[PDB]
Amino acid sequence: SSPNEFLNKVIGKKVLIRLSSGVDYKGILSCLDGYMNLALERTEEYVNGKKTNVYGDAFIRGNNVLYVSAL
Amino acid sequence: SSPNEFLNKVIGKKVLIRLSSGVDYKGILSCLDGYMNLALERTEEYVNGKKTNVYGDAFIRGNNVLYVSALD
Amino acid sequence: SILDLSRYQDQRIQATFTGGRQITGILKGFDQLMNLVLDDVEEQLRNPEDGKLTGAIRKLGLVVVRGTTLVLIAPMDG
Amino acid sequence: LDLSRYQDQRIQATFTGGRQITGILKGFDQLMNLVLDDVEEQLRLTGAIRKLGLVVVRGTTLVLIAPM
Amino acid sequence: TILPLELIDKCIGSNLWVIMKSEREFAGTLVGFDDYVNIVLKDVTEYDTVTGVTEKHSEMLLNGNGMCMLIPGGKP
Amino acid sequence: ILPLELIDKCIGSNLWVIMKSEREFAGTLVGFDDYVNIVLKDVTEYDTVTGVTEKHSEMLLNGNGMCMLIPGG
Ligand SMILES: [Zn+2]
Ligand SMILES: [Zn+2]
Ligand SMILES: [Zn+2]
Ligand SMILES: [Zn+2]
Ligand SMILES: [Zn+2]
Ligand SMILES: [Zn+2]
Ligand SMILES: [Zn+2]
Ligand SMILES: [Zn+2]
């Protein structure tokens, strides 16, 4: 179970993405690559509970987040 | 490497190393490697302008620093 | 992903950095490391202490985005 | 970069973001990851302190190392 | 002399206590890691230190960049 | 075109550099390396939070801290 292996295993599931700053993104994973860049479908941005944005498609740099967990 | 040239250009002299708007270091560059790690003698720590620490000999990860400039 | 982005070539995108900065700009190019070249970029200003988007813009023009601080890229709604 | 001089010495280290600890150098690598033993974080700089023991230090947040 | 990444290697299947640069901590079971020390943790419990509030995660990818310390064993 | 190349054509021109913090730098590009650490000279530094300016004859700007590099800025 590499980081990649873990990430593959969560494709198609609602995932929670936390930023060092306590901003969260949640959306269904969709794509990956060697460098942990993540592509998600519809994506929601929260500032501790408070939804503050929605993105139709989003690319997220895994290298630069806090963690990635499956909801 | 222009960074390498700049650093060598300043070995043995006093340098200002800014960690953040709040935190700086000052000391004499003494040594350096290719991962931008720095060795300094008589290095001092400043917080908001107040010299809160004197370390003497010290190592600093240039990689995890904002910048390195010649002092003055 | 290095494939996915090409789909948005020449189009205007949103970007978010670590630290909070947000910008918009036209995707002119990029590498595998996620360094971008954006054209006509406007940083969306933030309330100094609230953190919120004020609605005010700031123009920067042609810019190189560093992949080291890039968190999120996203196309325009629609 | 010649950290071998401080092997088994008690050293001090501060991190990006303000954390500061103390411990005995037990090893390291070229990327500045450290192994420290008998570690103690100075809590934040309230005189508070906690004991962490044997610790792997990451070089990606490591800012400064110093003797004592 | 001890090598950091070899120590981490020996911890697969063990409990780790991880301390970030912010006011966050994680305790879980090491499932695996990157050459870049991005880790996978199982049966994780997360600890906010400012608030003091806690939450839990069955499995998670904890990124290494923001890490300060990995403590073989657990909290506290 | 390539982001790295665009910086290359700027060696010798002015460069505006924006960090993830509230700190900004304007100077002239002396050169950079593979990791995009930057040497600037004749540099004027802007703390955007307080509002104070500062000056440097020559400095090494760490690449990991940068958000944006703006040619001719
Ligand atoms: Zn895709
Ligand atoms: Zn796919
Ligand atoms: Zn879609
Ligand atoms: Zn245009
Ligand atoms: Zn011990
Ligand atoms: Zn959590
Ligand atoms: Zn080319
Ligand atoms: Zn300065």
Q: Is the Cβ of F39 closer than 8 Å to some Cβ of chain B?
A: yes
- Where would I find the beta strands (DSSP E) of A19-70? 23-31, 37-47, 50-55, 58-61, 67-70
Beta bridge partners of E25: E19, E47
Domain extents in chain D: 1-68
Q: What is the largest CA-CA distance in chain E?
A: 39
Mutate to test the interface with D, among B33, B41, B61, B67 (most CBs of D within 10 A): B61
CATH number assigned to the domain covering E1-76 = 2.30.30.100
Are 3 or more Cβ–Cβ pairs between C and A shorter than 8 Å? Answer: yes
Mutate to test the interface with C, among A18, A55, A65, A68 (most CBs of C within 10 A): A55
Domain at A1-71: CATH architecture: Roll (2.30)
E37 and D58 Cβ atoms separated by less than 8 Å = yes
Question: Within 10 A of E51 (CB to CB), how many other CB atoms are there?
Answer: 8
- Minimal Cα–Cα distance from C71 to chain A, Å? 5
* Total H helices, total E strands in chain A: 1, 6
Question: Within 10 A of E55 (CB to CB), how many other CB atoms are there?
Answer: 10
Residue C58 Cα distances to C44, C47, E3, angstroms: 7, 13, 48
CATH class of residue range D1-68:
mainly beta
Burial class (CB in 10 A: 0-12, 13-18, 19+), E36: middle
Domain extents in chain A: 1-71
Q: What is the structure's resolution, reported in angstroms to one decimal?
A: 2.5
The residue behind tokens 């919120």 is C52
Beta bridge partners of C63: C38
Nearest Cα residue to C13 out of C1, C28, C3 = C28
Q: Which listed CATH number (2.60.40.420, 2.30.30.100, 2.60.40.4070, 3.40.50.300) goes with B1-72?
A: 2.30.30.100
Q: Is the Cβ of E23 closer than 8 Å to some Cβ of chain A?
A: no
E15 and E28 Cβ atoms separated by less than 8 Å = yes
Contacts with B61 from chain D: Cβ below 8 Å: 32, 59, 62-64
Bridge-based pairing of strands C53-65 and F66-71 is: antiparallel
Question: How much distance in Å is there from the Cα of E62 to the middle of ligand 6?
Answer: 10
Distance CA(F23)–CA(F8), nearest Å, equals: 23
According to DSSP, residue D58 is labeled: -
- Minimal Cα–Cα distance from F68 to chain C, Å? 5
F25 and F50 Cβ atoms separated by less than 8 Å = no
CATH number assigned to the domain covering C1-78 = 2.30.30.100
Question: Within 10 A of F17 (CB to CB), how many other CB atoms are there?
Answer: 24
Domain extents in chain F: 1-73
Distance CA(A66)–CA(E65), nearest Å, equals: 8
Distance CA(A27)–CA(D22), nearest Å, equals: 41
CA atoms lying within 13 Å on the CB side of residue C31: 13
F1-73 classified as CATH 1.10.340.30? no
E63 and A62 Cβ atoms separated by less than 8 Å = yes
Distance CA(C62)–CA(C56), nearest Å, equals: 19
Distance CA(B71)–CA(F53), nearest Å, equals: 16
Core vs surface per residue C39-51: b (16+ CB within 10 A) or e: eebbbbeeeeeee
